[PDB]
Amino acid sequence: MDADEIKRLGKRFKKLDLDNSGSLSVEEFMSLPELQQNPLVQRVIDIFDTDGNGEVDFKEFIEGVSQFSVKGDKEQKLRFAFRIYDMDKDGYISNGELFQVLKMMVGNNLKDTQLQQIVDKTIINADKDGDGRISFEEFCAVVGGLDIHKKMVVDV
Amino acid sequence: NNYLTVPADLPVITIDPAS
Amino acid sequence: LSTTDRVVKAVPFPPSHRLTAKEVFDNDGKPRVDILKAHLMKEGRLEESVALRIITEGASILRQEKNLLDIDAPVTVCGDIHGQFFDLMKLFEVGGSPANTRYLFLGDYVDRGYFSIECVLYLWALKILYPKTLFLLRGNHECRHLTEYFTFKQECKIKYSERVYDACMDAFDCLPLAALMNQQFLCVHGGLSPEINTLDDIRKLDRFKEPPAYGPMCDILWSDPLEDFGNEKTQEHFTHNTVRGCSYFYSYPAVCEFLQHNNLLSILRAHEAQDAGYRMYRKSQTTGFPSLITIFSAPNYLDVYNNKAAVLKYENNVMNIRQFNCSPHPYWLPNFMDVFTWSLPFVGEKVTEMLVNVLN
Ligand SMILES: [Ca+2]
Ligand SMILES: [Ca+2]
Ligand SMILES: [Ca+2]
Ligand SMILES: [Ca+2]
Ligand SMILES: [Fe+3]
Ligand code: NA
Ligand SMILES: [Zn+2]
């Protein structure tokens, strides 16, 4: 990041840190009205929270935001999208977490039975090495050509 | 857009309705 | 909730294993249709070579049949299936086991429903097992032109291979066009033709080909009764079929003339969805019997029509219409899309929106 960008992120971090604890809690993120309606907010917070303590410190915050820099690469953006699904952070999308993340996104536009069936079929058709889970490589083989990385950029 | 959506002589004739 | 184990455990996980030839053909080379049925109902697949053997052995039986089959009563006559495999399973329960029931299907096995290849495999295996008691006609969807535009080709490439699709297409070319049933009924998918005046005109066609864009083979597969059938102000026997974009509408006078000339009681056909699963059309004045009957065997068509399906069981000089409701089937996203392709656009959209609002 640029100097002026590093300065703007500090100011913004402090404004979100309602209790001036030096770390951002889920409640503090959820104080933003636009985020209350977004079903992936907890997933993004969890990815930023690389030390697993439940909150986003400033270092976690800058590292998180830099994934969405215009200077980032396809692999980096696609890796972030992968991590949205990979709840348990082992590097493989498994059946249970794929259902849970999709259910977050679709809510009641699908019944649990219909969603579980299409999750099963994607696990089966996209798993190439038989370990029953989707690696980042297996993931990119499916979606890498959709160019969603082009849309995952923010101005800091 | 808050939630993901799914994309877009003579024979007699008798009737046995659905069970 | 576990991130690895499955959330909705009451849904059985589909089998990944592909059945082999020894698993699918018994000690005499006969298909084990009970094995096949149970596996296909679980969305199980076959080894490619086994799928090709079913398709080609079935084609071989069809290839030795006449353009116009001669089928004695008793028989259960069925209309469109359109890939609705789980409704086909109910169909056999309602009409009776092929082990002791003679069957005639009027075509349209594939497209629209997402279990078209399972329909083909299971019906072809039954044809192999019951070569002289279960009969299959060609519908307008059993061709390359429609299956590449609708989803059957894509379905084959997702579940099997294009090689299996290609085998189906050559098999479909062998399907007979018509049946003369109990020497009383001409049975076809679509209907009549300007160029078909007698049954012998059907016997003279060359059917081993892709259906042409016009002509008698085309008309048998594609034609419809007039919208105002039996209520004609339309004085012409045949008019251009503006719904289909090919072939013709036929009128009630046209049908009654054909029946009288050829000493037939009625035409049995499919091809048009019906709310009740069937339609009985205006009686011929010379017979006192419906001149035309539509049978449609795909309940809750396209998962939205909310129609009943029917089959016609013709036995003991009774024409018994048996209706049935739709049955549950496993879910597929449209066009066999996987859940990553489906959801990733929304993921990219919403994580970017969060970040924009976080940074404001
Ligand atoms: Ca705080
Ligand atoms: Ca942390
Ligand atoms: Ca994982
Ligand atoms: Ca794998
Ligand atoms: Fe049809
Ligand atoms: Na082909
Ligand atoms: Zn049709």
Author numbering:
A (entry chain B): 15 to 170
B (entry chain C): 681 to 688, 713 to 723
C (entry chain A): 11 to 370
Lines from the paper:
The plasma membrane Na+/H+ exchanger 1 (NHE1, SLC9A1) is a central regulator of cellular pH and volume, and thus is important for cell proliferation, survival, and motility in mammalian tissues. NHE1 comprises a 12 transmembrane-helix domain that mediates Na+/H+ exchange and a C-terminal intracellular domain that is heavily phosphorylated and functions as a protein:protein interaction hub. Recently, it was shown that CN recruits regulators, inhibitors, and substrates using two short linear motifs (SLiMs), the PxIxIT and the LxVP motifs. We show that the two canonical CN-specific SLiMs, a previously identified PxIxIT motif and a newly discovered LxVP motif, contribute to NHE1 binding of CN.
Modeling potential paths that the linker may take to connect the two motif binding pockets revealed a set of basic residues in NHE1 (698RAR700) ideally positioned to electrostatically interact with multiple acid patches (AP) on CN (AP1:E205/D211/D229; AP2: E246; AP3: E237/D238). While the affinity is unchanged, a change in TΔS indicated reduced flexibility in the charge neutral interaction; thus, NHE1 R698 and R700 likely mediate dynamically important electrostatic interactions with CN. To confirm these results, we used NMR spectroscopy. An overlay of the 2D [1H,15N] HSQC spectrum of 15N-labeled NHE1ctΔ92RARA in the presence and absence of CN showed that nearly all peaks broadened beyond detection. This confirms the ITC results of reduced flexibly. We also determined the 3D structure of the NHE1ctΔ92RARA:CN complex to a resolution of 1.9 Å. Electron density is observed for CN and for NHE1 residues I681-A688 (LxVP motif) and D713-S723 (PxIxIT motif) but not for the linker; this shows that the intervening linker does not form a single conformation that can be identified using X-ray crystallography and highlights the importance of using complementary biophysical techniques for studying dynamic interactions. Finally, we tested the contribution from electrostatics and thereby the dynamics of the 27-residue linker using NHE1ctRARA (NHE1ct 698AAA700), which led to a 1.5-fold increased rate of pT779 dephosphorylation. This shows that the 27-residue linker directly negatively influences the rate of pT779 dephosphorylation.
